[PDB]
Structure formats: structure tokens, C-alpha cells
Amino acid sequence: SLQLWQFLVALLDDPSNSHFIAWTGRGMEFKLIEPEEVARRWGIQKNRPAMNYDKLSRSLRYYYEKGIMQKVAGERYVYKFVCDPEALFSMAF
Amino acid sequence: SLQLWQFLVALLDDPSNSHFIAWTGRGMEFKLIEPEEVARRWGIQKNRPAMNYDKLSRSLRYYYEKGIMQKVAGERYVYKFVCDPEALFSMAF
């Protein structure tokens, strides 16, 4: 049972997925190029066929509160993993 | 069962442990202020009473290979957690 952040890291590690999700090249920044495709694959992963970006974005919002991620200012689908002791702790536990 | 990197993160998060292990304030860098005390507490955690800094340093060496941590060049007891997609993937999986 993967957490959504783990699942995104696994998709980001394969450049074959770069058409729907990719590291932008700027540090730990990544873009949901096809956000509905990212949702569909998350749906397959968790056996939730009714998964959509609306549900996926609520999960990405929870990740700001934990300090794991931040939404890049001025962007609809660009986020970054945070590299600080708080993010590390939330990812470790 | 905690991994050594998780154990260090847990010790680092609690300022009660700051007399023997602490974040330096420079990004993800941390210092083993009392390296033998870190080693003794790792021993308590894993029920390995014969734990010492020698055994700990070799396990830290294994984490450099994984790509999760690195020893700060020119320092005896200063390390850092790595901020890159490879580190994130190794910590996630």
C-alpha cells in the first residue's frame, strides 16, 4: 500500500511517463502535464476506478500541511518536494 | 523496526537529543556531536549492546551507496541528507 507521494516518485523516476508527469529539471520541482492521466493511474494503483484530479488535488493539498510539498506560485499543476527536516520527518514516519 | 536513517531523523526532530545529535541549520546537514552516544542509543533501539561508532559509520557508508546520505567533505562527524530524485526514490522504496 503506497502513499500518493511514493507513487508520484515512482512515476517521476521513469522518463517513459514524462508525457503526463515529469521532473522540470529545477531541483525537486515536478509538473502534472496530464493531471487526469496521473489520477487515472493512481486509480488503477488503489483499485479506485472513480479517481479524478479533483480527489488527487485534495490529496496533494494534504501534502502541503505535512510540509512534504508546496504548490509552485503562479502554476496550476507544478509542485515541488520540500527538502527540510520537517518534510524528512513526515516522509520517514 | 526502524532503519538507521529513520532513527537519525527521529533523534534529530526532538531537541531533547540536541546535546548528542543536531541539525546544523545549513539545509539537511546534521552533526554527531557525541558520536559514541548516537552509537550507544542505536544499540538500545536495536537491542545490540555492542554497538559503537565504528559499526555505525560502516552502516552510514552503506547509506551513501543507497544515495540517501553523504558525509560532508573535510568533516569527521558531519553528514547531510541528500536532496535529489534518487534520494527520494530510495527513501520511498
Side-chain angles (χ1 to χ4, degrees), chain B residues 49-53 55-57 59-60 62-64 67-69:
Chain B
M51 190 54 67
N52 59 15
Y53 176 72
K55 288 156 198 188
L56 195 107
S57 56
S59 302
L60 290 173
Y62 178 79
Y63 282 145
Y64 319 151
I68 288 149
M69 284 181 47

Side-chain angles (χ1 to χ4, degrees), chain B residues 19-25 27-45 47 49-53 55-57 59-60 62-64 67-75 77-79 81-89:
Chain B
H19 56 285
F20 56 94
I21 189 165
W23 295 116
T24 61
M28 299 305 281
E29 186 182 79
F30 64 95
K31 178 186 187 106
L32 311 185
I33 300 156
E34 293 165 1
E36 309 302 328
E37 183 60 1
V38 174
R40 186 190 70 89
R41 296 202 184 214
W42 177 230
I44 292 173
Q45 185 72 28
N47 202 47
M51 190 54 67
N52 59 15
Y53 176 72
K55 288 156 198 188
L56 195 107
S57 56
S59 302
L60 290 173
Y62 178 79
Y63 282 145
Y64 319 151
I68 288 149
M69 284 181 47
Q70 67 173 261
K71 194 177 181 185
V72 171
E75 286 283 359
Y77 305 115
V78 180
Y79 307 77
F81 279 92
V82 178
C83 169
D84 70 9
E86 188 189 320
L88 205 67
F89 186 90

Side-chain angles (χ1 to χ4, degrees), chain A residues 17-57 59-64 67-75 77-82:
Chain A
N17 294 327
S18 65
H19 58 283
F20 58 93
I21 189 165
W23 294 119
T24 59
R26 306 190 128 184
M28 298 305 282
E29 185 181 79
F30 65 96
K31 181 174 186 70
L32 312 183
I33 300 154
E34 294 163 2
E36 309 305 328
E37 185 56 7
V38 175
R40 188 191 67 91
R41 296 198 180 221
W42 177 229
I44 293 172
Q45 184 68 27
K46 299 309 270 178
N47 296 76
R48 286 176 71 185
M51 188 53 66
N52 58 14
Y53 177 70
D54 178 270
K55 282 158 199 172
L56 189 91
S57 67
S59 301
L60 295 168
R61 281 194 284 273
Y62 177 78
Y63 286 144
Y64 323 151
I68 296 162
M69 289 182 202
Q70 64 174 259
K71 197 177 179 181
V72 170
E75 287 284 357
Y77 305 116
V78 181
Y79 307 81
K80 60 181 267 275
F81 280 95
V82 178

Side-chain angles (χ1 to χ4, degrees), chain A residues 2 5-7 9-10 13 23 27-28 81 83-86 88-89 91-93, chain B residues 2 5-7 9-10 13 23 27-28 81-85 88-89 91-93:
Chain A
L2 289 185
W5 75 264
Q6 293 176 299
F7 174 80
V9 172
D13 189 74
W23 294 119
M28 298 305 282
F81 280 95
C83 281
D84 71 5
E86 189 185 315
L88 203 67
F89 185 89
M91 288 186 303
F93 305 99
Chain B
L2 290 185
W5 76 264
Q6 295 175 300
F7 173 79
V9 174
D13 194 73
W23 295 116
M28 299 305 281
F81 279 92
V82 178
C83 169
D84 70 9
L88 205 67
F89 186 90
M91 284 186 293
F93 303 99

